[PDB]
Amino acid sequence: STAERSARFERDALEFLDQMYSAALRMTRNPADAEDLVQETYAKAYASFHQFREGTNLKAWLYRILTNTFINSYR
């Protein structure tokens, strides 16, 4: 189903939340900014599931959304 895949993607993504917030602490040097940066990355990630294909390494796909947001928001 379209809903199943997507719910599976969410949980897979969330499994990494901590590794992602931890990386975010190291790039923003600020809990508050680290959180905002993660949150916005996940929101962006939920919103684009449509484009995440099949094999694509999930972690690298999130890393990419996270850098794009670091750059274009924080900074």
Q: How was this structure determined?
A: X-ray
CATH code of 75's domain: 1.10.1740.10
Contacts of 9 (CB under 8 A, 6+ apart): 49, 52
- The dihedral built from the CA positions of residue 40, 18, 56 and 53, taken in this order, carries a sign that is negative
Count of C-beta atoms within a 10 Å radius of residue 48: 11
C-alpha separations of 18 from 1, 13, 21, 50, 75 in Å: 28, 10, 5, 23, 22
Instruction: Give the range of the structural domain holding residue 46, as residue numbers without chain letter.
Output: 1-75
Contacts of 46 (CB under 8 A, 6+ apart): 10, 13
Report the domain count for the chain. Answer: 1
